[PDB]
């Protein structure tokens, strides 16, 4: 029932609005689209693609948007198995949903799902197997009982997520269970220079700007600390009451979010 | 049942169908059977019957088969409490388990314990993590008071099996109880055929005898060796679908399987 | 219930919440003119006795919107699976009652590292810290509901939720400087007599390593300390004995005096 409610229904986001991760998609859409779009080229060799890929990275690194960016692109059912909908009390009422979860998926074709932040349930590695009753132990062993032991299905794509991978089992690095461990990690300069531009489309700044200065001025940072720049940079002009942005404004916007001097250089 | 077998006081394994000893088993005949047989003397002297015993030595000796066996002669309930399988990381709940069993033993009318690997209790405390080692004595110390409080019964006997004696020196717990501490043997070369005579029975094998077996059993003096050689020597006469053993398989068995019983 | 004209000091700190909350309801055409939308989130560092909760309750006085009342520990529950539902409840209703504000305080109760425990109860908060994340930025946008969260120490706490997407500015407070102690003192004392002794620019001074809250104790501890002398109005030396007291056991520099 409730599982029918959680469905994507078309958020608006492209792959044009993502930058430095110009190759890490080339692993992600290699497993999702092609077996669902172009399975013949694998078939020309005739092998089993991976299914049940994963992605891990630091926080704010830009992974959730991809998981919805892939939704509008595929024109296929996107399913969100989010938290607070798998670990309800009254045992049997918790782990039945995951059984019912796949059952919708086993029925339907051309289907892919999403598990947001599996660190809740999968991350609950049994504390030395302790606890005479472990409500999460039983419901984690079922999906691997769904996915390993014997084949769940043949055409369904799965992607997990994790801000913190070391929690969950050593059984979720293993075929059937899991195939790939993608790693989103911090950008480089040529990525950042293509993350600024998208967040500054709407912005009403005038040219005379060289973001090459800025990326050399913004060290190791996330893909979300680079939008907050665009807020505060655009904001200082507001308390100073100007109808346009400068470049120098960024230079004292950058100083805050990253945050007395190393005079020895 | 929940915990252990309890043997229904009559499951009668043969304490003499065994290549063990006569002196030790007769040393135990004193502390258990004599009072339960003959209270007319301890009463006459007024001494209370004894308080438990230790049986050191590493395995192969059969330091658990005799125990439940003589318990079967007298007919008490035989159970376990392996201290390796009693420790729990939580603060209490290692002592609770101690408290259940002294109670639950008394829920039954007779009952006797078989603790094993009790060095988990008696540790040297070389780490000295006071968050832990303050508790290690806490659960241990509860044993000392849970074991001999008001219990004036003549049924609730105690045993503790402890490989590696004297590894414990936080406390030797000497004074009072442990009225014996048996000087355990190992299987002497004379006892080999005393042992091989045990398991060889119940077989039609054209004999399968030899004096080249104790030499083979030299340094493999553990009861599992003989149990297993008779096992696998039984698996070689069928290796060719034969009808009866040859003793060369025994001279082959112990020579070629005590290897693991001497290197690891 | 309080208002502005009751702080005086915090000015470099206060312009932000204005820019987050009090303003955009008024003149959002500013933000869009640039092509920009304001923050969804705020946080306030600790350094206690410096006026954190005071600021939040101020804006409630004039906000023209719905405002909420939570401390970090009302979230948690007992039945092991009902906590995290409660978080989604408060955010959806705020949307139903939008435009709205929340205020979760002392959330060091909740916010801790992924400690990877073995208890059985400390897990059910980590999930409760997590639906928040999955709710707050998560997968889908939420609209115009703003967070003003607070704490007292963060230097090893509040692991991951502290990032853009969820929170954007990190105001911090400390014990004030000399310049602010001037005007803040006028605040409390603007109802008493102050007979003739004022001299206030030496009363408060550096090396009085005190707070921005103890001063009202000093203000009030003096009046009765003069009342008991049957003198309702006040002089200076009323305050001198007070400052002698309340400062006594804040700090001691016995380990100082080495950097000669």
């Amino acid at each position: 029932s409730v599982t029918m409610m959680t469905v994507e229904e078309k958020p608006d986001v492209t792959y044009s609005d993502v930058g430095g991760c110009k190759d890490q998609i080339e692993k992600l859409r290699e497993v999702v689209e092609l077996p669902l779009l172009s399975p013949e080229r694998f078939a020309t060799l005739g092998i089993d693609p991976p299914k049940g890929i994963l992605l891990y990275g630091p926080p704010g690194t830009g992974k959730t948007l991809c998981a919805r960016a892939v939704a509008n692109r595929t024109d296929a059912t996107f399913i969100r198995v989010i938290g607070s909908e798998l670990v309800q009390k009254y045992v049997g009422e918790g782990a039945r949903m995951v059984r019912e979860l796949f059952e919708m998926a086993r029925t339907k074709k051309a289907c892919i799902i999403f598990f947001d932040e599996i660190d809740a349930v999968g991350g609950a590695r049994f504390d030395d197997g302790a606890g005479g009753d472990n409500e999460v132990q039983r419901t984690m062993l079922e999906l691997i009982t769904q996915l390993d032991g014997f084949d769940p299905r043949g055409n369904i794509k799965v992607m997990f997520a994790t801000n913190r991978p070391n929690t969950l089992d050593p059984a979720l690095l293993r075929p059937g269970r899991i195939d790939r461990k993608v790693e989103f990690s911090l950008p480089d300069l040529e990525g950042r220079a293509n993350i600024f531009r998208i967040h500054s489309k709407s912005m009403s700044v005038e040219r005379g700007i060289r973001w090459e200065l800025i990326s050399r001025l913004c060290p190791n940072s996330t893909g979300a600390e680079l939008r907050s720049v665009c807020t505060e940079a655009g904001m200082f002009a507001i308390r100073a009451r100007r109808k346009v942005a400068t470049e120098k404004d960024f230079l004292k916007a950058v100083d805050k979010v990253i945050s007395s001097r190393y005079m020895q250089y | 049942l929940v915990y252990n077998m309890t043997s229904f006081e009559q499951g009668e394994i043969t304490f003499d169908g065994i290549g063990g000893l006569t002196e030790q088993i007769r040393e135990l005949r004193e502390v258990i059977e004599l009072p339960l047989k003959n209270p007319e003397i301890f009463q006459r002297v007024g001494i209370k019957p004894p308080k438990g015993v230790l049986l050191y030595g590493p395995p192969g000796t059969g330091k658990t088969l005799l125990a439940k066996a003589v318990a079967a002669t007298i007919g008490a309930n035989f159970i376990f409490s392996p201290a390796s399988g009693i420790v729990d990381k939580y603060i209490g709940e290692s002592a609770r388990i101690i408290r259940e069993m002294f109670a639950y033993a008394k829920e039954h009318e007779p009952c006797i314990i078989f603790m094993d690997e009790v060095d988990a209790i008696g540790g040297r405390r070389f780490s000295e993590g006071t968050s832990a080692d303050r508790e290690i004595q806490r659960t241990l110390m509860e044993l000392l008071t849970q074991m001999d409080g008001f219990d004036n019964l003549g049924q609730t006997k105690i045993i503790m099996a402890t490989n590696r004696p004297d590894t414990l020196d936080p406390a030797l717990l000497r004074p009072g109880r442990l009225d014996r501490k048996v000087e355990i043997p190992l299987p002497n070369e004379a006892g080999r055929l005393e042992i091989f005579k045990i398991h060889t029975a119940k077989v039609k094998k054209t004999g399968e005898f030899d004096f080249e077996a104790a030499v083979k059993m030299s340094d493999g003096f553990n009861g599992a060796d003989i149990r297993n050689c008779a096992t696998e020597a039984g698996f070689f006469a069928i290796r060719d679908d034969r009808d009866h053993i040859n003793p060369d398989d025994l001279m082959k068995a112990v020579r070629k399987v005590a290897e693991v019983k001497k290197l690891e | 219930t309080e208002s502005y004209s009751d702080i005086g000091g915090l000015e470099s700190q206060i312009q932000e919440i204005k820019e987050s909350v009090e303003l955009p309801l008024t003149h959002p055409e500013l933000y869009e003119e640039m092509g920009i939308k304001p923050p969804k989130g705020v946080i306030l560092y600790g350094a206690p006795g410096t006026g954190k909760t005071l600021l939040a309750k101020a804006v409630a006085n004039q906000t023209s919107a719905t405002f909420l009342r939570i401390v970090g520990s009302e979230l948690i529950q007992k039945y092991l699976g009902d906590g995290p539902r409660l978080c989604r409840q408060i955010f959806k209703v705020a949307g139903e009652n939008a435009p709205s504000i929340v205020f979760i305080d002392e959330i060091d109760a909740i916010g801790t590292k992924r400690y990877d425990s073995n208890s059985g109860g400390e897990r059910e908060i980590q999930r409760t810290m997590l639906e928040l994340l999955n709710q707050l930025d998560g997968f889908d946008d939420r609209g115009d509901v703003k967070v003003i969260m607070a704490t007292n120490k963060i230097e090893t706490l509040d692991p991951a939720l502290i990032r853009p997407g969820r929170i954007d500015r990190k105001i911090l407070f400390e014990n004030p400087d000399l310049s602010t102690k001037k005007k803040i003192l006028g605040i409390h004392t603007s109802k008493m007599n102050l007979s003739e002794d004022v001299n206030l620019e030496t009363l408060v001074t550096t090396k009085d390593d005190l707070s921005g809250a103890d001063i009202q104790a000093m203000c009030t501890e003096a009046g009765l300390l003069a009342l008991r002398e049957r003198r309702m109005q006040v002089t200076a030396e009323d305050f001198k004995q007070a400052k002698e007291r309340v400062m006594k056991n804040k700090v001691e520099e016995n380990l100082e005096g080495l950097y000669l």
Binding site: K89, Y90, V91, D133, E135 | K89, Y90, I91, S131, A132 | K78, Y79, L80, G81, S117, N118, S119, G120, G121, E122, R123, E124
Partner: peptide, 16 residues
């Protein structure tokens, strides 16, 4: 059907 389970409703636990 009032087989209302105790819900496995958690509780703290001291360590080590």
């Amino acid at each position: 059907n009032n087989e209302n389970v105790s819900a496995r409703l958690g509780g703290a636990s001291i360590a080590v």
